[PDB]
Design an enzyme around this catalytic site. Structure first.
Site, short mmCIF file in Angstrom:
data_model
loop_
_atom_site.label_atom_id
_atom_site.label_comp_id
_atom_site.label_asym_id
_atom_site.label_seq_id
_atom_site.Cartn_x
_atom_site.Cartn_y
_atom_site.Cartn_z
N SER A 79 0.71 -1.16 -0.01
CA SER A 79 -0.13 -0.07 -0.08
C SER A 79 0.94 1.37 0.00
O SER A 79 1.96 1.41 0.48
CB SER A 79 -0.93 -0.02 1.18
N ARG A 80 0.50 2.18 -0.79
CA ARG A 80 1.13 3.53 -0.89
C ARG A 80 1.08 4.42 0.27
O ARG A 80 1.71 5.38 0.58
CB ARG A 80 1.01 4.14 -2.19
#
Lengths: 267, 128, 116, 43, 57, 305, 116, 101, 116
Positions: free
Chosen positions: F170-171
């Site tokens: 996940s960013r």
């Protein structure tokens, strides 16, 4: 050489590189535990067999041919382990081909049967899996089919001279008639009533078998680590060459498929 | 100067000892300084090596060969070398009772092996 | 066998069968090594390498790029040299004695000069 | 990272043919010992 | 003793005395010691490449 | 939920399961089967995003699920090929990357001056044979801020669901999570990454060292505890107590086969004996000094039986 | 588990886990051999081969190519035979007794006839 | 490297002789009467005691001896096209006696 | 050497040769230890650990993540600090004295303040 054939060859080569790298790391941990057993066997052989060096025990004439014992393993994937043990025993058997051979492994018995199948008198399997101990060396010496009726008794094995390479050495074993016929054999206070000549001669065969099995297992484990590192390094070069061919085939497949749709739509 | 090395580990290793009252094949002998070269066998007894003072270690050896070199070197090569505290008194009585009942009850090497095991178990229990 | 004879047909099938077995097992010799083979596969790998270099003869027009003379083997001399090497009569010679040579006469002269 | 669940037997080359022959040779040797022991226990 | 009359020499007498002394001592001190008294090698006496009875134990 | 490209039987089965669990009263369903025209299936992503944008512009939150992203790209290329237009790569138009990036950029989180709403976009990229670097798979992964990979090999082993930790990331990181779950997820991320690289030594258990045996036992219990059944979601308070027992060392003494029975026994006993610790972790959303000492004493007393 | 039951769901998940684990262990045997497998890996390789041949039954329309008669197993007989082989009740039987057979009744009759 | 498996020695030796006997030359077709006698001697184990290099000479010698001595067995396999109990016993006895020259 | 000069070319070639030899020797140090080497290999392995951390200086915008101040080393100060460490002038310093530092003056002030 299509898209499906390049993907199956690249995926199969990647799984072989992971198994070769994991086997090399497991061989390094097993070499540390085997080094302690090899150091204890080398120190005990210099003290138990110290009486033969001070008394000058040697053989003389041949009595009913001789007896050879090739100590090895039963598994492969160890490089030139079975090839070096078979080449050393075949060179010494040229001057005396009537002697018997006692193979202590499936790898040494397969190579010796293609050259001298009639010379093999004993075959032992299942000794190259676990580590050697005193129970395995004492059981093979008592059931060697009359091992005390020979003039010369050699023990062909592999001696680890370094921590990367090895060499095939040999150690002789005296019989009961040669232990009491030494030069300085009467220098020690030995009892003539009880068994002193036949007991000391039979004890040297089990002691030398344990030292040869411990040194042979350490040399085979060290040679297996070099073969596993070479197989993992060769798999990386083949995966790099296959990745360059798969990248060029993927770009050519996209250009060939787009040219077919552009030619049919323009006509 | 003793070299009591077994077939699995080294006890004396380096020459840093004086007296060694190890049981040989004859009687309970003891090596002093520069003893005579007597390369006799060892029996299953107590190999207590007196280090200088009263720092003797009661090593219960199971037998071997006490080689004595001419340069004041005692190489007591045995098979096993365990201390006196490494043998429980409860488990020692069970092995002596099973060897006495199996002796003189069968044939082949069953009666011969049980007679030699009963003599070694009786000497180790009396030296506890 | 109806145009080249029964002798030339057996030599062509035996030489092609040995090269096909070594090429299919190239994945194990390049990864595991040559020591992973058995007793029968070890003898076939050594004979396939010497048979591939013996068929490459130096032409007369390529004398300036190779340095050796031009060799022109006949049809009868090429069939007798390939049958003797596959039967076990030239197994003691080296692999470099047959590279860039002629028939059976040039392979025996190159092995004696390299060992002196 | 990459998927390699059974990529050796799915290729069909040198490594694929050797894996099938090794499993068939080990299963044939074990079937002879199991068949001989079952016949002696029924009589 | 009288072990010379049978088929046991100094090598067989030392292995039987060392294994019996370990089992008669403390049961909790048997770490890395039970593997030195058991094996699995089958000694098969070959003749002419046939063999006879594969004796083990 | 925007069902695009599915059949008629798949849309009726998904709507009946949500109504039985009280979940269809506040969920929009955009029916778009493959039996209609190419204009209705291609405009299913733009029509579903416009209806869900009304909640984010007022003060509420929305969550769009474009199922699937691969079916939406085939409908847009079918109408462009019949309108006398030039094609491109993989028989697609020139605006292939702009068609998926325009509908995914509208689902963002607004600030406090716009209303304080947000919108989530869950596009499912149906890959071919596990190749994540294709034509339509590389365009949706580069425009989104994270991707959850799903392999077919881990689903048949026992992982439910098959979610690769080494491929999915996940960013946003730990900035969009609860403070109570972030304390247990920090130590579990380092133990899961080290056990995956050393997972090849599991076949040779007789040659393990001290550090190798501790990583294999702790890594196997953490992966099996996160496996949940279908339609069985957990809250934030129940997942924080199960992750703390496997990261500290309270689950290493149990067996591998008893990992399924230990998840239901520890969750049921914590709701009747220590109910004050589970209710405080959900309301406050963090863990102070008093919450760490009470959780370690309750897990040690229940591990002895 | 809500359509076929809790008993049928455990048999389907156990058969899929054993077949998937055998593919990863087969790659290591082609390079290292059977010496790297322990007690649990040796029993899993023999159970995976017998479970794959037990699911292949002779069809009634394919009697001209197989030669044997056609067998039809019910739904209750197939779930009971797969659960008993995964527990350790048919570990002493061979792999040829389950190949081209029906349910649990045909596997026991084929093992006794092949040993005579 | 495996040289064991005593029970598999009969199947491995019979497979190599069956592949060489079925390989025919160019423009050399065989009828149904000559192919039925060659396939019965290789599947029943009668060709396992012969050599591998003599597989080509054994096919021509077996067809020539069945056309001058036991000619009734070759004509029955082509006219009727099958083999009953009397044809199976006569074909097995003639193949075993012809192996010893 | 024709764009940065002869002084900058010698410092760049020496730092790249020491880092490449230490990276390739990482596989032999984990299986044979760190004391099973020669005299020249032991001195090069100690200097390679401190040189890898000396080039990683803390930036001015990353002061809220590491806690150290921002160091802006020039081109003349970076070439003089790398040449003195490769000649043996900073061989007695610790490996942690060069981490999160920049220039030759920062390594002398951090090493004297770490112990006392």
């Amino acid at each position: 050489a299509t898209l499906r054939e390049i993907e199956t060859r690249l995926k199969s080569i990647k799984n072989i590189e992971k198994i070769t790298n994991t086997m090399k790391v497991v061989a390094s941990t097993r070499m540390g535990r085997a080094q302690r057993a090899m150091a204890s066997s080398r120190a005990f052989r210099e003290g138990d067999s110290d009486f033969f060096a001070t008394a000058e025990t040697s053989t003389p004439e041949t009595a009913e041919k001789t007896l050879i014992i090739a100590v090895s393993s039963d598994k492969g994937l160890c490089g030139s382990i079975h090839s070096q043990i078979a080449k050393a025993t075949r060179a010494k058997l040229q001057e005396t081909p009537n002697a018997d051979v006692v193979t202590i492994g499936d790898k040494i018995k397969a190579q010796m049967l293609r050259t001298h199948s009639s010379n093999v008198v004993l075959s032992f399997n299942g000794v190259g899996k676990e580590a050697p101990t005193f129970w395995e060396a004492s059981l093979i010496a008592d059931e060697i089919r009359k091992l005390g009726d020979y003039d010369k008794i050699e023990v062909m094995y592999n001696k680890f001279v370094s921590g990367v390479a090895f060499e095939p050495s040999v150690f002789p074993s005296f019989s009961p008639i040669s232990i009491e016929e030494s030069p300085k054999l009467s220098e020690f206070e030995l009892e003539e009533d009880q068994a002193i000549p036949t007991s000391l001669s039979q004890i040297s065969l089990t002691n030398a078998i344990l030292n040869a099995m411990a040194e042979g297992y350490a040399s085979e484990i060290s040679a297996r680590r070099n073969a596993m590192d070479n197989a993992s390094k060769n798999a990386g070069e083949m995966i790099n060459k296959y990745s360059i061919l798969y990248n060029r085939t993927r770009q050519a497949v996209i250009t060939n498929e787009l040219v077919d749709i552009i030619t049919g739509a323009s006509s | 100067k003793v070299s009591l090395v077994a077939p699995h580990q080294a006890i004396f290793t380096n020459k840093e000892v004086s007296q060694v009252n190890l049981p040989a094949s004859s009687g309970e002998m003891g090596v002093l300084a520069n003893h005579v070269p007597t390369v006799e066998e060892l029996a299953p007894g107590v190999v207590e090596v007196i280090e200088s003072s009263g720092t003797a270690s009661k090593y219960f050896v199971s037998g071997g060969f006490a080689s004595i070199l001419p340069g004041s070197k005692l190489s007591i090569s045995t098979v096993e070398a365990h201390p006196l505290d490494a043998f429980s008194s409860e488990n020692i009585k069970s092995l002596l009772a099973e060897a006495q009942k199996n002796a003189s009850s069968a044939d082949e090497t069953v009666a011969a092996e049980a007679a030699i095991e009963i003599e070694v178990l009786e000497a180790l229990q009396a030296a506890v | 066998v109806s145009v080249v004879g029964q002798e030339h047909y057996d030599v062509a099938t035996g030489v092609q069968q040995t090269l096909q077995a070594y090429k299919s097992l190239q994945d194990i010799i390049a990864i595991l090594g040559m020591d992973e083979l058995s007793e029968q596969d070890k003898l076939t790998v050594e004979r396939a390498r010497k048979i591939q270099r013996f068929l490459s003869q130096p032409f007369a027009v390529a004398e300036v790029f190779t340095g050796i003379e031009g060799k022109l083997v006949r049809l009868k001399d090429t069939i007798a040299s390939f049958k003797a090497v596959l039967e076990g009569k030239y197994d003691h010679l080296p692999e470099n004695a047959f590279y860039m040579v002629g028939g059976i006469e040039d392979v025996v002269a190159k092995a004696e000069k390299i060992a002196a | 990272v990459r998927s390699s669940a059974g990529a050796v037997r799915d290729a069909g080359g040198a490594f694929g043919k050797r894996e099938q022959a090794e499993e068939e040779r080990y299963f044939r040797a074990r079937a002879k010992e199991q068949l001989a022991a079952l016949k002696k226990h029924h009589e | 003793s009288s072990w010379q009359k049978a088929g046991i020499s100094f090598n067989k007498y030392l292995a039987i005395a060392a294994r019996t002394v370990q089992r008669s001592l403390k049961n909790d001190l048997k770490v890395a010691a039970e593997k030195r008294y058991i094996s699995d090698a089958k000694v098969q006496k070959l003749e002419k490449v046939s063999t006879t009875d594969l004796a083990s134990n | 939920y925007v069902a695009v490209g599915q059949k008629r039987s798949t849309v009726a089965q998904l709507v009946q399961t949500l109504e039985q669990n009280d979940a269809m009263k506040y969920s929009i369903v955009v029916a778009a089967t493959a039996s209609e025209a190419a204009p209705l299936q291609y405009l299913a992503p733009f029509t579903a995003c416009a209806i869900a944008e009304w909640f984010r512009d007022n003060g509420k939150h929305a969550l769009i699920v474009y199922d699937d992203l691969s079916k939406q790209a085939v409908a847009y290329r079918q109408l462009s090929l019949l309108l006398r237009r030039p094609p491109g790569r993989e028989a697609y138009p020139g605006d292939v990357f702009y068609l998926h990036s325009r509908l995914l950029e509208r689902a963002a989180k607004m600030s406090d001056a716009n209303g304080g709403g947000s919108l989530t976009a869950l596009p499912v990229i149906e890959t071919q044979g596990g190749d994540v670097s294709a034509y339509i798979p590389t365009n949706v992964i580069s425009i989104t801020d994270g991707q959850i990979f799903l392999e077919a090999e881990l689903f048949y082993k026992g992982i439910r669901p098959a979610i690769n930790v080494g491929l999915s990331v996940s960013r946003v990181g730990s900035a969009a999570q609860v403070k109570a779950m972030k304390q247990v997820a920090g130590s579990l991320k380092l133990f899961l990454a080290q056990y995956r690289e050393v997972a090849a030594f599991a076949q040779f258990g007789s040659d393990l060292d001290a550090s190798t045996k501790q990583t294999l036992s702790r890594g196997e219990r953490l992966t099996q505890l996160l496996k949940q059944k279908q339609y069985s979601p957990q809250a934030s308070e129940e997942q924080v107590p199960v992750i703390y027992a496997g990261v500290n060392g309270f689950l290493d003494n149990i067996p591998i086969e008893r990992i399924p029975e230990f998840e239901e026994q520890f969750i049921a006993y914590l709701k009747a004996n220590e109910g004050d610790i589970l209710e405080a972790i959900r309301t406050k959303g963090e863990l102070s000094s008093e919450l760490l000492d009470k959780l370690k004493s309750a897990t040690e007393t229940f591990v002895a039986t």
